[PDB]
Chain A
């Protein structure tokens, strides 16, 4: 039931608390970063491609 879920999320929420974040790239509801509007999967995928400016593997 993905497309309908993606569409319904796009529309304004009837009540403020009901608005939630999905991955804009794939629609995943869980583990969506606010800075990037991406889930952990797409984030890791695109960070590898070098298409998320400023992000690189962290080591210390």
Chain B
């Protein structure tokens, strides 16, 4: 995976939006197109609406999701069976 030296990756525009809200009694949804961004522990408690190609899917970030990309929780293809 991504080299340990490089550290974990998150887009600064997304990281800024979460940082602006950390000290918030009531959080609000963060609309993002950054599927590539890693879920940091600071994301826990937020709902990040992730673009899946056509819409923003609201994903609630539980502490069990840390380390996974935001895109892992916004499937791009719809398949209900043949």
Direct A–B touching, Cβ under 8 Å: no
Chain A residues packing against B (C-beta within 8 Å): none
B residues at A contact (CB < 8 Å): none
